[PDB]
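Thread: Modeling a multi-component assembly for a lab meeting

Hi all, long-time lurker, first post. My supervisor asked me to bring a structural picture of a complex we are working on to next week's group meeting, and I have zero experience with this. I have the sequence lines for every component (431 residues in total). Could someone generate the structure of the whole assembly? Inputs are pasted exactly as I received them:
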Amino acid sequence: AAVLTQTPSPVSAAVGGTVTISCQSSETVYRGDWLSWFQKKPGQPPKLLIYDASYLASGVSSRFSGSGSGTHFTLTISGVQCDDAATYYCLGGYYDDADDTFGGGTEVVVKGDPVAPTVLIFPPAADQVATGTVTIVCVANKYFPDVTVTWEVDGTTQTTGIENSKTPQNSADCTYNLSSTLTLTSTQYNSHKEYTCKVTQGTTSVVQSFNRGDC
Amino acid sequence: QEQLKESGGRLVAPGTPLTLTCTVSGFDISDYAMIWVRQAPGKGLEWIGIIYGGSNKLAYAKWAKGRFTISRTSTTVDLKITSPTTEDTATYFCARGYGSMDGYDRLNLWGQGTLVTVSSGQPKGPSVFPLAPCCGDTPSSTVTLGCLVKGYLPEPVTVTWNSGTLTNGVRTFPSVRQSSGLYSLSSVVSVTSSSQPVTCNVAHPATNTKVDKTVA
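Re: Modeling a multi-component assembly
Sure thing. I ran the full set together rather than chain by chain. Output:
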């Protein structure tokens, strides 16, 4: 059973820098060189970067280069750009097509300048309350590196009803945006006054609040 | 112009067979090989199978074990999922490789993919709720508004602003699936306070839902 193992996710690379990730096959790929590399971004199809270990795909920047043979292969990205933030997949090709398999993927995180988020909070409008369930939405905009989000309701930390969702890095400045939602029943929601969202970035926190009954 | 386009992704209950289609244009399938691949949400890319346009050659991944059937017509190739399980929820992509006979390489042409959902739930269009800030004492010349698109199944929905004429800096977050089985996402946009109001346009093709919400 042919197994491909890639460099553990995530790999960090500084803007303008060089990063090399690797792919190791449990058996020889076809002719020692059938190994393709693909860039994959959410919402977009896979994109061939390298085929047969070291051939650059048409129209792909030469900042991408591949090397290796037999059972060990690398992809090197030089002059790293925010636009390179993606998960990279190797695809090993074998004598019997039925054995063909992707590695598990290596997510490359591109390190731009650090920025604290600006944080927004959105109370539920009247129409949601009427449904009996409400969602309070906190957004952290334009930030790097990663953050953690804490909800406090009337001074009490929330531990349930929270879901977070993060955009991919901005292809121009490497920043993320994040959505954090707290879901409660309308009567639970109406039993509290102060809703606070706290976004923490190491030693930095940005905190945003509203008081129900001021809107 | 050589192109691929996959269709047929939709919501099905487990056990209900489903057929996807990749329609080709600008080249002849007979001169190439065609490969199916998928990606489940959260998981990596996964090679499923291949059909050679020039021969009787066709192979499925060793793990398939009859889970998939691949076939062609003169301008399409198809992938049938014989007895879907929740594990087959994924986006499926079609790709062209060189080598028509036996032996393929260089997967440099891909479709946009089609989205399959396997679930015992019934389709459900989204509820759309406006997001507006509480607002403080020092008025701003700019404001960020949004729409919460909640409780739909299957993915995807699309969200535009002012029928497509408001796009600068929009943030639409990846969907999240709740323990209900339904999905939610939010989208926000920043605009000058003088340009309001601003309307989010939400569409959910799986139920042919189209909802506009003007945000105040």
